[PDB]
Design a protein around this ligand. Structure first.
Ligand SMILES: *C[C@H](COC(=O)CCCCCCCCCCCCCCC)OC(=O)CCCCCCCCCCCC
Lengths: 403, 218, 393, 218
């Protein structure tokens, strides 16, 4: 069966517009599957970069109390809070102070954390060649600054900081601005919009500015699960205080996952439509071929083979054409996918216009990884559509012999 | 001792404008007895081959086969009879371009066999039977049209033949080999009985054999 | 019947009794182009509706292209509003904005303030709650905050907050003497948009005293635009006397460039769809010429020139493209039109919640015209080869 | 005078056999009378009919028209020369089985002056003059096989056909009423017609023309 179909394809080399009837279908399948592969690789790269650049540094959840700032280690115990589902926890100080330096200024949400607790809790390294995290202790009261914020203030590794700090008072003495400048400890790079808000101070030293004692706000979670966060974050009562509503990792950055999945579905459907159009092309060439080789189909009928073989012959013909197109497309897609970031950088340099804005996007560069199961899915769907297209000429291949 | 006659006739599908072919057909093929027809098939007589052999359904009357009327069976069943017993050459031009002649002759056996190994062996021994060992493994279009019919007959008889509805056995080749095919066809008769019914219009060999009939309009 | 040789092409379209009209091979290109245009128009219109939803959200409640003098604040006597009618605007109103930082008793925040006169109406007016802006008279140093800004700062109503203007003084040898004056909150505005958290309403005179501008001059005039997205075109205009034309492209603008790039990316994918359809076009004609290469011989000697027959196959592919483009655009616009009203509720699958749509007629027409051009330019190769020589008559 | 033939041959690949048709011939067309050249076929004689028409550039050959050469003109110039003055039928059933028989007859009429009142009127009577009025609106596919050729004969004749170079008025005929087409060309000559070059491959019942020639395979 394979002999007749395969020699039918390679046989038609003279006449029949060889350079306009088959290479065109090959190009159609190639662009279709190649761009779909590139898109899926880009989406998988987005998932990987989101997991290793947002999930590893953002707290997996938050606990808050509308009452006085102290929640744990003064009024309650975080050890009671540890229940099956949470990997670790550490108290965090939500300390918004904002920074102005005259002509230069930006908005930051200063945060107070113990270096050992954050090192054990979540993977948030200094992300700089300086590697000053080991020196970042409750000593000289150094302050971490994000790259975008440091860029705004035009500050560097070692210098003073024009940080503005507020004061609190129970309705006795209000509006008494104060400023303390101690030091700056490196940068904190994520190549995302988070780099313009984060600024970290040792928790013990942070308590020395906000005038209280042994009192820390909530925000103490680190969760081994990364999707069940919305459910088991409801672990209040172990600290009492307020249990009406506590912020979680859902909502603040949960829309990113929804967007990634939705883009995947849209791109998949659109490229399946592309493959369907190319299958229209191949069914057209199939019906033309069966009209051309009607005499041969007649003589094969004269020589035995029943209705089945001719159907099989032309189904194999169409499937072979589609398979060649899909193979060319998938090899192009694989070779271009593993070099996606270099080629995007190349075209960005040539165009001279940054494709992804660091201001609004969290990547600043286009990632890509290949899963080698998406490729199998691509070939499966391409061959299935090719067979579906080939079905009709198969039925219109049982023509009675003209003579 | 087999009828082969059912007073069958064929007409066009409409029958009001287009004409028809000769009426009250009376084949008497019977067993493996050789026949020859020279009744000027150029006027149009190939329609019987479209009926005799189950190529197309006849408008009126049927054909009695070896032991059962093949017209009263499924096309799948009919195709099996055509492959196993009947051998056709006709004038389909028997051209499989881009398909090598060695496999081309073996095609009817290549529709399924107990052991693929010996299918090729039958092809070569028929090529030497017709004398076509030279230039066997190459395209038929490359080969001249003189040997085009030489390989054509082999495909008809490569399978074990019992009915051979041969048309134009001479081809366009020399009279020495044109007459020698009778010796070649006679050799197969020595092996076992096999019918050779020929419909042509060339009168050179019309009287050359026995059991010759003629029917153009009756 | 028509001395334009289109009779031959039109009859090829209809075909004989056993031709490709009923075998879904002549109109296969048509349906491919139809689906391509369907995707184009539907997705582009929906995503344009998404973009327009942001137009009303973050630009319908934001200053747009304040007209400020070259030296600094513009004295209203020098350049009165009576002679600033620039084409393309909707109306005009004085306003004063600037970067300020807000510190309450507990927390601190940053925003931009609106020096507006309560006498004129405000696009934020239908979003105030339990507050009427007429209380913003000079002297009281009043201010209205945003719901998100109030939540961030904690204060709700009747509290006193301080505003610090960075662009002031910072030159005295006493370290710094920034312009600081206390203000009291009166209420919040609860527009369901992200403009909150950095937008507050103040009186014009209070704004003038805040920024140390001499006299009661104003920074500039708010300039509404009917189509603010195309403001860059309005940038080049004859501004009366010396002034700047400073826009929202500096504070915002990166987000809108990003959404435009997203629009272009979606357009590129759906244009890949239509380009695959165009590639499908050429083969169908290539078959339609390689077959019927017999009948061209009959016509070739009968008299018509190669240019005469170069058109009949040219119109053969083009007419398929014409029908597909119009049918796709018309039916496609129908899908978008019914996807907001009488929309079959499928909000559980996608994000849902009344998918906004904005069918822009100019956008649809251009796409249909491009589909016409792409389909027609594709047919040239089969038509050009359709008249080469007289082979195998 | 009208057309002056010269050495015409067919060329193939230089490495293989070119298979030249002829290399020493020179014939002229008298304005008013006609020729008849038929010999042993099998060397492109059927395709040689297309050689006379403006279809392919001759291989080491050339033809001339009245007062000016035909092989030294552009394709646009060739069009008018063979549109309203020159027409000829072909070997097989080349009658464009897509339009109506009325349109096939009026096909070269449509390519020219737009006299739609005259175009439809002339074709019906002229086809009736051939012997076909009833069922003329039928498609060529739904038509008699022999009737397919006679329709083309009317198609080959136009308003002012200066010359026809067809060579197969015979073929699918009836021998009872198909003999009329033989005298139709002569009747136009008897009614002040033009030169009608026509001759069939079989000289029997066809040498009734002005003068009789033979075909050579030089
Ligand atoms: C939210 C998304 C984000 O925008 C994009 O996804 C842009 C697409 C780019 C993604 C591809 C990543 C790799 C880049 C290069 C890939 C190949 C490039 C090819 C160059 C030739 O935007 C949207 O999805 C908004 C659109 C909303 C429409 C969704 C549904 C509307 C219609 C629903 C029913 C229709 C029948």
């Amino acid at each position: 069966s394979l002999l007749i179909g395969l020699r039918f394809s390679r046989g038609r080399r003279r006449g029949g517009m060889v350079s306009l009837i088959s290479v065109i279908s090959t190009i159609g399948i190639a662009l279709g599957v190649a761009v779909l592969i590139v898109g899926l690789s880009a989406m998988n790269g987005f998932e990987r970069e989101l997991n290793n650049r947002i999930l590893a540094v953002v707290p997996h959840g938050e606990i808050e109390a509308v009452d006085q700032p102290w929640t744990n280690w003064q009024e309650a115990l975080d050890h009671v809070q540890k229940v099956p589902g949470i990997a670790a926890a550490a108290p965090y100080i939500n300390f918004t102070g904002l920074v102005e330096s005259g002509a230069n200024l930006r908005a930051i949400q200063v945060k107070g954390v113990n270096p050992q607790q954050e090192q054990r809790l979540s993977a948030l390294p200094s992300f700089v060649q300086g590697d000053a995290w080991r020196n970042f202790k409750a000593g000289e009261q150094q302050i971490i600054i994000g790259k975008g914020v440091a860029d705004a203030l035009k500050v560097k590794q070692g210098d003073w900081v024009s940080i503005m700090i507020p004061n609190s008072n129970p309705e006795h003495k209000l509006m008494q601005p104060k400023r303390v400048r101690l030091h700056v400890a490196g940068i904190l790079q994520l190549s995302g919009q988070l780099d313009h808000s984060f600024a970290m101070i040792p928790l013990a030293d942070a308590q020395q500015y906000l005038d209280m004692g042994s009192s820390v706000s909530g925000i103490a979670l680190k969760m081994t699960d990364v999707f069940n966060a919305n459910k088991l974050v409801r672990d209040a009562g172990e600290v009492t205080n307020s249990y009406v509503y506590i912020k979680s990792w859902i909502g603040t950055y949960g829309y990113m996952y929804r967007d990634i999945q939705m883009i995947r579905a849209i791109m998949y459907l659109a490229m399946v439509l592309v493959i369907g159009v190319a299958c229209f092309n191949i069914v057209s060439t199939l019906v033309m071929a069966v009209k051309d080789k009607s005499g041969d189909i007649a003589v094969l009928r004269t020589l035995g083979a029943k209705d089945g073989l001719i159907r099989a012959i032309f189904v194999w013909y169409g499937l072979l054409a589609g398979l060649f197109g899909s193979l060319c497309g998938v090899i192009i897609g694989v070779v271009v996918s593993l070099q996606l970031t270099p080629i995007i950088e190349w075209i960005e340099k040539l165009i001279g216009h940054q494709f992804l804005s660091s201001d609004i996007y969290f990547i600043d560069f286009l990632p890509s990884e290949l899963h080698w199961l998406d490729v199998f899915y691509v070939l499966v769907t391409a061959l299935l559509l090719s067979l579906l297209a080939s079905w009709y000429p198969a039925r219109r291949a049982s023509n009675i012999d003209p003579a | 001792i087999l009828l082969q006659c059912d007073n069958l006739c064929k007409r066009y599908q409409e029958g009001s404008v287009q004409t028809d072919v000769l009426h009250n057909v009376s084949f008497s093929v019977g067993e493996g007895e050789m026949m020859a027809i020279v009744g000027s098939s150029g006027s149009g007589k190939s329609t019987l081959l479209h009926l005799l052999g189950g190529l197309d359904t006849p408008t009126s009357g049927d054909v009695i086969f070896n032991g059962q009327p093949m017209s009263k069976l499924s096309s799948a069943a009919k195709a099996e009879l055509r492959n196993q017993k009947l051998g056709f050459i006709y004038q389909f031009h028997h051209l499989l371009p881009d398909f090598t002649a060695l496999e081309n002759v073996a095609m009817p056996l290549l529709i399924g066999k107990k052991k693929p190994a010996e299918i090729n062996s039958r092809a070569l021994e028929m090529l030497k039977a017709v004398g076509l060992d030279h230039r066997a493994n190459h395209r038929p279009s490359e080969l001249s049209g003189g040997e085009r019919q030489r390989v054509a007959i082999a495909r008809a008889l490569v399978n074990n033949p019992r009915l051979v509805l041969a048309d134009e056995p001479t081809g366009n080749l020399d009279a020495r080999n044109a007459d020698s095919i009778f010796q070649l066809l006679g050799e197969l008769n020595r092996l076992q009985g096999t019918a050779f019914l020929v419909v042509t219009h060339d009168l050179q060999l019309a009287k050359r054999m026995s059991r010759q009939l003629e029917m153009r309009d009756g | 019947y028509q001395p334009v040789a289109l009779f031959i092409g039109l009859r090829y379209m209809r075909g004989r009794a056993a031709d490709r009209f009923g075998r879904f091979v002549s109109w296969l290109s048509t349906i491919g182009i139809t689906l391509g245009v369907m995707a184009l128009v539907t997705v582009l219109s929906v995503m344009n509706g998404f973009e327009r939803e942001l137009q009303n959200n973050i630009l319908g409640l934001m200053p747009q292209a304040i007209l400020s003098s070259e030296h600094g604040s513009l004295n209203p006597q020098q350049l009165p509003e009576t002679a600033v009618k620039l084409d393309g605007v909707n109306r005009v109103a004085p306003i004063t904005t600037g970067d300020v930082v807000l510190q309450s008793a507990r927390s601190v925040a940053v925003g931009v303030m609106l020096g507006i006169d309560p006498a004129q109406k405000d696009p934020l007016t239908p979003y105030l709650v339990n507050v009427k802006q007429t209380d913003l008279e000079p002297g009281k140093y009043n201010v209205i905050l945003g719901e998100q800004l109030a939540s961030q700062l904690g204060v709700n109503r009747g509290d006193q907050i301080r505003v610090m203007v960075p662009s002031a003084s910072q030159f005295t040898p006493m370290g710094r003497i920034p312009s600081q004056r206390l203000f009291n909150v009166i209420g919040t505005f609860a527009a369901n948009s992200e403009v909150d958290g950095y937008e507050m309403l103040v009186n014009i005179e209070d704004a003038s005293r805040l920024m140390r501008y001499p006299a009661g001059n104003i920074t500039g005039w708010r300039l509404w635009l009917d189509e603010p997205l195309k403001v860059d075109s309005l940038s080049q205009q004859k501004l009366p006397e010396g002034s700047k034309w400073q826009d929202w492209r500096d504070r915002k603008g990166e987000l809108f460039q990003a959404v435009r790039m997203e629009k272009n990316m979606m357009g590129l994918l759906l244009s890949l769809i239509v380009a695959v359809a165009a590639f499908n076009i050429i083969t169908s004609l290539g078959l339609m010429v390689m077959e019927k290469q017999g009948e061209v011989a009959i016509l070739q000697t009968q008299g018509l020139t190669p240019r005469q027959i170069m058109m009949v196959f040219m119109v053969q592919g083009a007419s398929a493209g014409i029908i597909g483009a119009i049918l796709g655009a018309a039916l496609g616009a129908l899908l978008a039109s019914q996807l907001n009203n009488l929309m079959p509720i499928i909000g559980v699958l996608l994000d849902g919640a009344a998918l906004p749509v904005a069918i822009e007629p100019l956008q649809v027409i251009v796409i249909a015209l491009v589909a016409m051009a792409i389909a027609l330019l594709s047919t040239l190769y089969p038509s050009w080869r359709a008249a080469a020589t007289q082979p195998a008559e």
